[PDB]
Each structure stands twice: as C-alpha cells, then as structure tokens.
Design a protein around this ligand. Structure first.
Ligand SMILES: CC(C)c1nc(CN(C)C(=O)N[C@H](C(=O)N[C@@H](Cc2ccccc2)C[C@H](O)[C@H](Cc2ccccc2)NC(=O)OCc2cncs2)C(C)C)cs1
Lengths: 99, 99
C-alpha cells in the first residue's frame, strides 16, 4: 500500500501469532512494541523518546508481518503506549519516503 | 525525491532565517524543533511520547523551507532531543509513504 500522512499511518502487524495495530515511524531506528511476552533470549536496553528514556528488552530475529509484508528483525519490547514500527523493519518491507 | 529509510531521513530546513537539519518524521503528529528564538506570539503546550512529555512554545503559521518546499504551519519549540518535522508539515509539502 501507499499511505498518506494526513492521518497517522496505522497498520496491522502480526507477531508471535498475535495481531496488533501499529504506527509506521520513519523517525526512529528501532521498532518498539507495547508489553507482550515473546520467546527467545533478550538483552536489556535503554531508549530515549520525546520526554525521556524508558527501559526495554531487545529481542533479535523476531519475524514480524506488516500489512502482508514479511520482516525478520530486532524488536524492542517495553513501556510504550504505541507499537511503533521503526526504519529497519520499514526498509525490510521496502518502504520509502516520497515527495 | 524518493527517500530510502536505510538511514535517518534528515533534510535541511530554512526557518525564520536559520537553516538546520530536521528528521522527516511520520511517527509525529507535530513538528518540534530544538530551543530557539522566534518572532510572534505563542501559547504554552505539552507534547509527549516515549519517556513522557515536555514543555514547548507553540507558534502558528510559521514559514518553513523543507527541500525547496514552502510550508506555513504550527511549530512547537522546546527541549526536544531532536529536530522533528511532523505530519502537520509533511502533508503540506505533499509527502507520503509507499510500499
Ligand atoms: C497514544 C498513541 C495512541 C499516539 N499518540 C500519538 C501522537 N503523539 C503523541 C505523537 O505523535 N508524539 C510524537 C512522538 O514522540 N512520536 C513517536 C511515536 C510515539 C507516539 C506516541 C507515544 C510514544 C511514541 C515517534 C517519533 O518518531 C520519535 C522521534 C524522536 C527521535 C529522537 C528522540 C526523541 C524522539 N521516536 C521515538 O520516540 O523513538 C523511540 C525509539 C525507538 N527506537 C529507539 S528510540 C511527538 C514528537 C509529537 C500518535 S499514536
């Protein structure tokens, strides 16, 4: 698809076999998801948002399906009020900024 | 311009009379720039995200130059760890996501 920015670019993502609504975010390297248990090893991380930093768990090689598109990559799980799909996965699904 | 997402989508913006780098951010409802002086009035405001919210000055109908593209809109000024160009202005310059 080709999403416009008049409204927040929200889409459906599937991960761990669970379906979630996410926001496409060119403004961030990594992808952050709302708390949700996931399998695998994981290292602790600290990431800074607009109002400060939050602690997250970084999982690697996690398959995440975005709007029908396949992606496998590093996912950060933690206190975020919104599942934000970052650049790495964006490029994985062939997303670009056009103007 | 076709922007890949493999790297930060930074672009030069000319505002007021200053030319600085800002991120084309589709994960932001608003445009936020780092502390600076701007002419005009302004109502205080609190914008938030990961880590919480921050205090910013809201200026409206502010001229902004983003890659030979002229836009006139709302510009929040304050303690942002990054110069952000949000959807309010991205749409103005006719920008979309495609994949
Ligand atoms: C509540 C929820 C349903 C929503 N609210 C909104 C509206 N809001 C609040 C925003 O758009 N808020 C913006 C914002 O921070 N957007 C964010 C997405 C988000 C939205 C809501 C809650 C948490 C994260 C997305 C933005 O690209 C910012 C920009 C940025 C860059 C460097 C330093 C700080 C910030 N990115 C991050 O906060 O990235 C965190 C990281 C990810 N991986 C590593 S750090 C502000 C800049 C204005 C959209 S969805």
């Amino acid at each position: 698809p080709q999403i416009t920015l008049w409204k927040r670019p929200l889409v459906t993502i599937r991960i761990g076999g669970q379906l979630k609504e996410a926001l496409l975010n060119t403004g961030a390297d990594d992808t952050v998801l709302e708390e949700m248990n996931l399998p695998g090893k994981w290292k602790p991380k600290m990431i800074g948002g607009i109002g400060g930093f939050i602690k997250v768990r970084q999982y690697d090689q996690i398959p995440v399906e975005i709007c029908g598109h396949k992606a496998i990559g590093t996912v950060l799980v933690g206190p975020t009020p919104a599942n934000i799909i970052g650049r790495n996965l964006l490029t994985q699904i062939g997303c670009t900024l056009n103007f």
